[PDB]
Amino acid sequence: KKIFKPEELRQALMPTLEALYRQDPESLPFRQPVDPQLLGIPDYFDIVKNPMDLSTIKRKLDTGQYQEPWQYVDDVWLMFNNAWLYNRKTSRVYKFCSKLAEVFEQEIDPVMQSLG
Numbered sequence: 001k002k003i004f005k006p007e008e009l010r011q012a013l014m015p016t017l018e019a020l021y022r023q024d025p026e027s028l029p030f031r032q033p034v035d036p037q038l039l040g041i042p043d044y045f046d047i048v049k050n051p052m053d054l055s056t057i058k059r060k061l062d063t064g065q066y067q068e069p070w071q072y073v074d075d076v077w078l079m080f081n082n083a084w085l086y087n088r089k090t091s092r093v094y095k096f097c098s099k100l101a102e103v104f105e106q107e108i109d110p111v112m113q114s115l116g
């Protein structure tokens with residue numbers, strides 16, 4: 001099995017995360033962990049059992065928490081699935097998530113080809 005070094009993963013994958021941060025306004029709800037009380041959505045953790053956001057993913061890349069590229073992809077997709085689950089289809093967060101998912105799919109594919 002291929003062993004991926006933490007810096008190899010950071011070099012390959014961090015640009016794909018940056019591409020999501022670069023989306024404005026669409027990344028704005030995703031740049032920090034959800035704070036349900038501050039945001040006035042106290043039911044959030046009743047619906048979303050495994051929160052995830054861009055800042056948490058960035059920290060995981062920085063601190064070598066991913067052994068394999070697919071673990072990174074899984075966390076980005078967790079973030080998207082949380083948003084599509086929690087938010088109504090008409091909402092900004094839902095539509096913004098849909099755009100980030102388009103951007104991410106485009107960015108991640110050539111990078112995954114390069115890592116194999």
Ligand SMILES: C[C@H]1Nc2c(cccc2C(=O)NCCCN2CCCc3ccccc32)NC1=O
Pocket residue numbers: 025028029030034039041082083086087092093
């Ligand atoms: C990921 C999580 N985000 C929110 C949600 C609902 C309300 C506010 C937020 C939220 O992130 N608020 C902080 C950003 C404030 N703000 C910044 C400008 C764009 C924008 C768009 C939609 C909702 C909020 C918003 N739903 C969620 O699933």
